[PDB]
Amino acid sequence: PQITLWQRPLVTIKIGGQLKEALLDTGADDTVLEEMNLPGRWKPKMIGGIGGFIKVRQYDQILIEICGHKAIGTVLVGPTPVNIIGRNLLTQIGCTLNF
Amino acid sequence: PQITLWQRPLVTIKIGGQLKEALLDTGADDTVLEEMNLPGRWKPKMIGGIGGFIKVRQYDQILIEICGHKAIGTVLVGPTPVNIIGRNLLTQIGCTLNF
């Protein structure tokens, strides 16, 4: 599709047979999801934004379907009002910004 | 231009005939630029992200230039560690996320 920015670019994604809402974020290096149970062993990771830095948990090779588009990679889990899809996944589904 | 997300979508902007560098962020509602001095009255605002909330100075009917195109909008000035172009101006230069 072509997502415009009059409103937040929210999309439905699927993870573990679950449909959830996510935000397509060109300003995020990594994908950050809300608190949830993912398969496996995590390592610790630090990420920074406005407020500063926080330590999140990280899982590898996680499958997420974005608008019927399969992507597989690193997902971070930490506190957020929304799941965030960063360029690590947006590249995969093939998203670009046009103007 | 059509931008890829292999790398951060950083662009050059021209603000107060001073030409900074900023990242096209669709995760951002508003535009927030590190500290500087612009004309007009500013009103305090408080914006939140990873790591929390910072207090910024809000200015309106501020003119910016993103890759040629002229946009008008509110712009928040403050303690960001990277200049961010948000939805508020991205729409003005008619940017879309495509996949």
Q: What is the DSSP letter of A90?
A: H
**Resolution of this entry in Å?**
2.4
DSSP, collapsed to helix, strand or coil, labels residue A89 as: helix
Do the chains contact at B24 and A84, CB–CB below 8 Å? no
d(CA A56, CA A86): 15
DSSP annotation string for B68-86: S-EEEEEEEEES-SSEEE-
Nearest to A10 by CA among A49, A66, A60, A51: A66
Beta strands in A1-99, from DSSP E residues, in sequence order: 2-4, 10-15, 18-24, 31-33, 43-48, 53-66, 70-77, 83-85, 96-98
The sign one gets for the Cα dihedral A34, A64, A86, A42 is positive
CB B74 within 8 A of CB B38: no
Q: Point out the residue among A9, A29, A52 whose CB comes nearest to the CB of B26.
A: A9
Distance in angstroms (rounded) separating the CA atoms of residues B45 and B23: 21
Q: A39 to chain B, minimum CA–CA distance in Å?
A: 24
Spell out the alpha helix ranges (H) of B1-99.
87-90
For residue A49, the tally of other CB atoms under 10 A from its CB is 22
| Domains of chain A (ranges, CATH numbers) | 1-99 (2.40.70.10)
Q: Is A25 a catalytic residue?
A: yes
Q: How was this structure determined?
A: X-ray
